[PDB]
Structure formats: structure tokens, C-alpha cells
Amino acid sequence: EWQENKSWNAHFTEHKSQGVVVLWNENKQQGFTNNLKRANQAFLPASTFKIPNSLIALDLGVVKDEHQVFKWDGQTRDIATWNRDHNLITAMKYSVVPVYQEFARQIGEARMSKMLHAFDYGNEDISGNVDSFWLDGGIRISATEQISFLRKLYHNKLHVSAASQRIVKQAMLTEANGDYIIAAKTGYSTRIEPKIGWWVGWVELDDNVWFFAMNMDMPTSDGLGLRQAITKEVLKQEKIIP
């Protein structure tokens, strides 16, 4: 049910990179990766934690819906797109950390901990500050664990409302055309070594769904475009996208 495909290493080597891509074929119930060991290594989730954070904040009524406006607190920060008003759609699109830090404080430690246990998310450990544990605390998740969590979200089987799950899946929409749809989230963990980049989500076709999770070494921010580019080279090679 898990097969290793070392030919995908060519895509990492040609881009002067090191990492893992994991794919799951939903119709055939089979997994594929270039590296079984790194596929089961657990890291900080960084901004991929926006998926479970959104679901918990909607189910508890901390966020009313995808149109509610969260006003800029007034403080300038290094990322320009953060210095304005946002809704859930634009906060996910531009990875707006301060909006999600406010969500976490309103949820509080006790509810965050007990809701994550329900989703069986990684090592289920939230030790550290209630508003940064996913950036520099004790929570850890592997690429094969991201896939388990995403399949449950896709089939509306997490223990929250169907409506909450549909709103978060809409907010993950990244790309669509006549050939495929991609729903996904990026991450970048820089506070604790080793510094890594993430991309997790799925490709919906007419007759099948392909789940994916990838992470890669990211010693500096110059390689961030490679999260998406290396994943799309694997998808083209396997004939999932043209």
C-alpha cells in the first residue's frame, strides 16, 4: 500500500534541493513517495496549521462566516499584504499570522487542546504560547499524517459541521481550469531548525482525487517558489496534470 519511487529525486537534484513528495490515489487506495523515511518524519506545521485553526474558530462561532471582516490592528509589519483588513478567504491566501493569532487567544488553551485531540492531528501536543505553538512550540506532524487529516476533511468526516468543512475547503482553492482543480495550503517554518517549506492539498479530476504533501529544506526564502514547482514536475511525470 506504500511504494517508493526514487526517479522523483531527479526533480529535487535538478533544482539544487532536498525533500519529499507524498501522493495518495483515492480510487486505488495506494500511496507513493521518493523517500519513506522522510515521509514519516514530523516537523512544525507552520502556516499549514491555518487549516485546523480555521475549522475550530468557525465551529465555536469565533468566526461567523467567510465574509466577516477582521480590521488591521494599525501596526506595520515586514509583509505588505498583512497591513490591511482581511476576511477568511484573503487571510488564508496571504498567510496573515496576526489574524490567526487573535483566533487562537479567543479559542484558549483548553478548547484548542481538546479540539485537536478530536482531529487526531500529529502528536496532538500544544505546549508553548497559545498564540505561537505551531511556529515555535511542541506540535509536530509528518507528510503521511497531513494526508490522513486531509482525506477526512475532503469526505466531511472530521467531528465538526459539514458547513465549517465546506467553507475551509473553499478558502483553500488555489488553481482551477478545464483539466483539474487544486485546493492547498503553503507553509514556511523558520523559528526552529531545520528551516523547511510545506505544500499540502489535493488535485480533483473528473473521475479521481490525488492527495499530496511535500516538505523541503529552505535555508533561505529564495527557494519558496520550488514548493509548488517541484510538486507540479512530479504530477506531470505521473500524467495526473498535462
What CA–CA distances, in Å, run from 182 to 21, 112, 144, 170, 232?
16, 28, 19, 11, 11
Element (H, E) at 22: strand 19-25
Contact assessment for residue 33 and residue 172, using Cβ atoms and an 8 Å cutoff: no
Cell 488555489 maps to which residue? 174
Cβ atoms of 67 and 87 closer than 8 Å: yes
The CB density around residue 72, as the number of other CB atoms within 10 Å, is 15
Instruction: State how far the alpha carbon of 74 is from the alpha carbons of 40, 85, 154, 178, 221, in Å.
Output: 41, 10, 37, 42, 26
**C-alpha cell, 153:** 476533511
Domain ranges of the chain: 2-237
Report the first-to-last Cα separation within the chain, whole angstroms: 26
Instruction: Name the grid cell of 99.
Output: 489574524
Helices H / strands E in the chain, number of each: 10, 7
Residues classed as catalytic? 47
Homologous superfamily (CATH) of 2-237 is: DD-peptidase/beta-lactamase superfamily (3.40.710.10)
Q: Resolution to 1 decimal, in Å?
A: 1.9
What's the chain's Rg over C-alpha atoms? 17
The length of the chain in residues reads 242
